[PDB]
Design a protein around this nucleic acid. Structure first.
Ligand SMILES: [Mg+2]
Ligand SMILES: [Mg+2]
Ligand SMILES: [Mg+2]
Ligand SMILES: [Mg+2]
Ligand SMILES: [Mg+2]
Ligand SMILES: [Mg+2]
Ligand SMILES: [Mg+2]
Ligand SMILES: [Mg+2]
Ligand SMILES: [Mg+2]
Ligand SMILES: [Mg+2]
Ligand SMILES: [Mg+2]
Ligand SMILES: [Mg+2]
Ligand SMILES: [Mg+2]
Ligand SMILES: [Mg+2]
Ligand SMILES: [Mg+2]
Ligand SMILES: [Mg+2]
Ligand SMILES: [Mg+2]
Ligand SMILES: [Mg+2]
Ligand SMILES: [Mg+2]
Ligand SMILES: [Mg+2]
Ligand SMILES: [Mg+2]
Ligand SMILES: [Mg+2]
Ligand SMILES: [Mg+2]
Ligand SMILES: [Mg+2]
Ligand SMILES: [Mg+2]
Ligand SMILES: [Mg+2]
Ligand SMILES: [Mg+2]
Ligand SMILES: [Mg+2]
Ligand SMILES: [Mg+2]
Ligand SMILES: [Mg+2]
Ligand SMILES: [Zn+2]
Lengths: 158, 102, 50, 79, 71
RNA sequence: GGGAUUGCUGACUGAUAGUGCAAACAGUACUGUGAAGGAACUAAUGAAACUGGGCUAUAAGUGCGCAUUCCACCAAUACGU
RNA sequence: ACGUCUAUUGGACCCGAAACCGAUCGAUCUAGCGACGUGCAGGUCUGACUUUAAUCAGGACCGAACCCGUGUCUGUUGCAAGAGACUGGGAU
RNA sequence: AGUCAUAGGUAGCAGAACGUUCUGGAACAAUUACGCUGAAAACAGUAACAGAAUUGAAGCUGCUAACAUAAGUAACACUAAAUGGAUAACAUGGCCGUAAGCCCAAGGUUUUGCAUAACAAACAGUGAAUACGGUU
RNA sequence: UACCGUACUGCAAACCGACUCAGGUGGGCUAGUAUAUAUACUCAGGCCAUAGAAUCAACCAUGUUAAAGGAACUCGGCAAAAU
RNA sequence: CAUGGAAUCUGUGAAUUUGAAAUCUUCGUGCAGAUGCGAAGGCGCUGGCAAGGGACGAAGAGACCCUAUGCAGCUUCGCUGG
């Protein structure tokens, strides 16, 4: 089966600067994958009714674009996307010690994490849903606070 | 030695090995008294010896590029507590502590 | 003068010396790559990745 | 002896030992944080004065069907 | 500055006499909790003794005193 | 001459042997800037060195699985099941 | 002809050189060159220009950052397969 | 089966045997062996007759692996300094302060965060929205 | 108005030296006495984890002081002291 | 006298070396300088902390000399080559 080719750093350096295509076709049969991560249970109850959150984070593949995630969410799931922020992650290293001790090492496939900021759909904008105290008192209280303890060592008992 | 003054000899030294020897003697005493039906205060430590364990080989970095070792050693303990025909001489005189004072 | 530290790491120099393209630029570098293939090495060059 | 023939033999040799990136590929996977490797994205524009301009015909358009609601085919067929 | 031959098991045992520890001829034993220590050392709960029941000290009455607590 | 299938082929070897590799991932881990070098590891059994203690002081049966030859269907020319 | 023992050609009872000839890889250590860029606290002396004035020169001097390693001592399976301390040399 | 003669040996030469693995002669260990001795030796105690050998090891500063000795010896001395029943949050004391502080580069590439042991890596974390660096 | 970098470390226990190696590693920012980025103490900030515990061995290393002399030492005032 | 090792304790924890050792002295002998042979004598046994005369201590199968059908580089009115 045809799969991921090896790439070479000198080859991408020499044959550099990918050019934009001359024509872009509307994408029938798209191949694009998104998944949410874990939500807080109160956020899960926030999604169970009325289906909305201000900030949702997604796992995607690293060959996507902020424009593609925004266009896909707006086109398919009917959302209003305000901004997308993308982070490229390496896969996790995995260790799966063998019948003779070898230290078999794996690497998960690289993924891109998108932070999508949403917008209230139509007329429902009330669900942004949030006395005073002086900031001089805040800083003066946070300056007389006890310091954080130094981090214990993994063999150290406290 | 008998069992109580063996516990006394282990409990009177600051060595790290004495805690492991106490663990072995306490395990042997627990087997002898609850697993078996031997009488206490007559148990004598009639057989105790140390055998080799599996080592963990390491490396130490001598000067001029020469290698060395910091092998982590292990050992085993076999303890056998016999029961004597009479309660024996305790070999170490039991005196009153500092707390037992008027 | 203490020796032993001849390897001063640099990604630019590593790819520019032992990379794929300088190996392919000359004929004897191409037979170097060919005998790396005939031996069966899993990593063909220092800059190969996927 | 040609340059393309050597690269094709390298790729055929790399067809074996493929899948979930085991062994040397675990370290080689970290080249994407060392030399600014360009991923498999489609370019949507070009720099003229250092400000990027997205060409509007290269913006992504998805031809989604009119209604995927009460459509009579599901992703699963009954046994 | 270097051994010329290999030490035998008998010679090694003779050389290792300094490494052995002497047995102690006295011990202070608490009758309640069965603790063991020297006669000059406290081995009750204030020191390390998780088995202490306080019966090691059998009398401690001291109610009266008067002073200025500095606050 | 060279590259792959088959060997009712072997007075070839049987895990320090036989290929460098009988193994989850061997041209691997690892070494070297690089070309290049390049391991160990099967399943049971558990010898010696070594170190503590003690002492002394009936060349058979019975089940399965196939191969050979009979049979009866066969492409009907090497056997096809 | 077989068997045994010698002999010759083969690596020819086994292990061990310094070598010689080719054609791979190495200036990420180091030597030279080339392109681009950066740095040289504080003072001292001499010469020149202009002065109502916020300029230049010296393979100049003392001296930090920086570069090097003179002497002594320590260290010698060392902290280090060439280091440390104190004195040192250069520092437009 | 009674008399005689011979029997020190290096280099070397000659003669007789023991043992290991495999094969041929149809098959010599399915259900083991185990009276502890015998023989001049090599050895034997699970055939024998022939054959084919990667056929015998204290001895090559041989190679590989394991285990000792030195030996619980040397080392754990470059530095600022620690104390209070804790590598403490608190208190006391000290050290650097053109660094032993702060911000980056090269290089490294997850070494980064969480549990008064614990069952926790299997889980998290890097957001370009100031004309940030690159790509030109 | 996309794509890549953004964690952590970076005079160092995370880089180059087989090591938690007394070695080597580029640029920038900075307060007072005060006056120079030197020197002594200190600001902001950081640190007192990687062997601990007492004590009068000899001896070794590194220093302080030393009466009267003073290179008489030594291959050589080397090393210290001194300006 | 001061600081830091060393010496004591607790915890971590090597290596050089090693035919086997249960290894005395003197004189003699001897591959020609003996722990091991001969004669005479001495010695309760085992260690810690020190000093290093011996164990022809250990560390390099090359300090110097000689030899090889020995190599290597260099030199020249050594030889031969376009
Ligand atoms: Mg230097
Ligand atoms: Mg190296
Ligand atoms: Mg093999
Ligand atoms: Mg093996
Ligand atoms: Mg082989
Ligand atoms: Mg096995
Ligand atoms: Mg045995
Ligand atoms: Mg013949
Ligand atoms: Mg080159
Ligand atoms: Mg200087
Ligand atoms: Mg001068
Ligand atoms: Mg004879
Ligand atoms: Mg005779
Ligand atoms: Mg047969
Ligand atoms: Mg052989
Ligand atoms: Mg100790
Ligand atoms: Mg504390
Ligand atoms: Mg970085
Ligand atoms: Mg980004
Ligand atoms: Mg430094
Ligand atoms: Mg080193
Ligand atoms: Mg360091
Ligand atoms: Mg200070
Ligand atoms: Mg400390
Ligand atoms: Mg005077
Ligand atoms: Mg001290
Ligand atoms: Mg003599
Ligand atoms: Mg003595
Ligand atoms: Mg001694
Ligand atoms: Mg000759
Ligand atoms: Zn008690």
């Amino acid at each position: 089966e045809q799969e991921t080719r090896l790439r070479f750093v000198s080859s991408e350096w020499r044959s550099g600067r990918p050019q934009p295509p001359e024509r872009r076709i509307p994408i029938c049969f798209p191949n694009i994958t998104l998944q949410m991560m874990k939500l807080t249970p109160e956020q899960m109850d926030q999604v169970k009714e009325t289906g909305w959150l201000r900030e949702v984070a997604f796992k995607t593949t690293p060959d996507v674009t902020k424009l593609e995630i925004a266009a896909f969410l707006q086109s398919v799931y009917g959302m209003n996307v305000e901004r997308v922020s993308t982070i490229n992650y390496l896969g996790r290293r995995r260790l799966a010690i063998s019948r003779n001790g070898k230290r078999l090492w794996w690497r998960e496939d690289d993924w891109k994490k998108a932070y999508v900021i949403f917008r209230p759909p139509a007329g429902q904008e009330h669900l942004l849903t949030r006395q005073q105290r002086p900031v001089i008192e805040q800083i003066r209280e946070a300056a007389r606070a006890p310091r954080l303890p130094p981090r214990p060592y993994p063999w150290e008992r406290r | 030695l008998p069992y109580p003054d063996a516990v006394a000899q282990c409990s009177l030294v600051p060595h790290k090995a004495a805690r492991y020897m106490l663990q072995a003697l306490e395990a042997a005493h627990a087997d002898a008294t609850e697993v078996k039906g031997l009488d206490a205060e007559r148990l004598v430590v009639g057989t105790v010896f140390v055998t080799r364990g599996a080592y963990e080989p390491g490396i130490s970095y001598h000067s001029k590029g020469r290698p060395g070792s910091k092998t982590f050693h292990r050992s085993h303990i076999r303890v056998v507590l016999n029961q004597a025909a009479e309660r024996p001489a305790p070999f170490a005189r039991i005196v009153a502590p500092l707390m037992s004072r008027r | 003068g203490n020796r032993g530290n001849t390897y001063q790491p640099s990604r630019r120099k590593r790819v520019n010396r032992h990379g794929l393209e300088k190996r392919l630029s000359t004929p004897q570098g191409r037979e170097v790559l060919l005998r790396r293939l005939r031996k069966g090495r899993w990593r063909i060059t220092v800059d190969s990745f996927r | 002896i040609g340059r393309e023939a050597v690269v094709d033999l390298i790729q055929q040799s790399a067809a074996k030992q493929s899948g979930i990136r085991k062994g040397w590929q675990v370290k080689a996977a970290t080249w994407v944080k060392r030399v600014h490797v360009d991923r498999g994205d489609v370019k949507v524009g070009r720099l003229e004065g250092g400000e990027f301009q997205v060409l509007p015909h290269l913006r992504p358009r998805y031809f989604v069907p009119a209604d995927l609601d009460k459509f009579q085919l599901k992703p699963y067929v009954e046994v | 500055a270097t051994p010329k031959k290999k030490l035998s098991l008998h010679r090694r045992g003779n050389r290792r006499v300094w490494y052995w520890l002497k047995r102690k001829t006295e011990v202070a034993k608490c009758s309640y909790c069965g603790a063991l220590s020297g006669r000059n050392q406290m081995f009750s709960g204030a020191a390390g003794n998780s088995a202490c029941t306080g019966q090691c000290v059998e009398q401690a009455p001291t109610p009266p005193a008067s002073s200025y607590p500095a606050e």
